[PDB]
């Protein structure tokens, strides 16, 4: 009865969550078999990262992900990829790239001079 669980790591004001495959009788922060993904709620991009191949293998061998893990699977594209109904679509949004410090410095120098 293996189910994918979220392990509470990080800091109180901005929690950090991993995505782990482990037995249902293990701990929230204890025994783990593999580390496959993560979740970042503090960043409003809401960065999502997951190993598609490992997730697919676990779903095939018969994992029973919980509701939040299944929601993350929909968000990334893994659940609908497995089911094959709509296909493979990526709803994830990447973090906005930070403008380069070098170009910021160049613009500032140009403005100054």
């Amino acid at each position: 009865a293996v189910k994918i669980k979220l392990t509470r790591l990080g800091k109180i004001r901005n929690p950090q969550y991993r995505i782990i495959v482990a037995d249902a009788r293990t701990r929230r922060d204890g025994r783990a078999i593999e580390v496959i993904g993560r979740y970042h709620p503090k960043e409003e991009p809401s960065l999502i990262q997951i190993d598609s191949e490992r997730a697919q293998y676990w779903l095939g061998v018969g994992a029973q992900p919980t509701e939040p893990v299944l929601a993350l699977l929909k968000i990334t594209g893994d659940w609908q990829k497995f089911k094959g109904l709509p296909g493979a679509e990526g709803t994830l949004k990447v973090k906005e790239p930070k403008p380069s410090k070098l170009d910021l410095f160049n613009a500032a120098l140009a403005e100054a001079e």
Binding site: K101, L104, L109, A112, E113
Partner: protein
Amino acid sequence: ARYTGPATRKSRRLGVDLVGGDQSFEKRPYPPGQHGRARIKESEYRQQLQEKQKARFSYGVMEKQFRRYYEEANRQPGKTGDNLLRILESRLDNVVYRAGLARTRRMARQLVSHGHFLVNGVKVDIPSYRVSQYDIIDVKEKSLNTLPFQIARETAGERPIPSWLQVVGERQRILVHQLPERAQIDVPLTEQLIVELYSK
């Protein structure tokens, strides 16, 4: 917890001027107190203590701050003395002072603590703020219109701005490019003695 007592007394006691505009020091170079003229036995411990006191009380830094500065410098791959002096100069108060926007370390520290400057467009108010290579420091309009800041920027005729520091315009923007070298810093006193003592 800053220092409230006199700034001239430390110079008088340790025998070398610090601010450089101290008239009382040259007036009475002898140690202050009732028996400053008495001879003192020379000792390596005395020498090391005087050097470290000079450095710490001249830069106004706190003791634990200096201690972990030293530990970080020692852990740094480069030579401990060079690392220590570079990180110590990296302090924003000394950065602005050598940029010439400030006339005294105490007033510069108060200005930084109250936070009249802008760091990368975000207001930061930390007197011991860490400043790294290739950074940008900005100035707020509430500081530009401030009277003493205007006096400093229109009377900046102090010692020449060092190599790693340079001002670009009337906005008083300070930039750092490369890693200072002991020789081109040419700071008074010596660091070998201090590092030896802190190794003791």
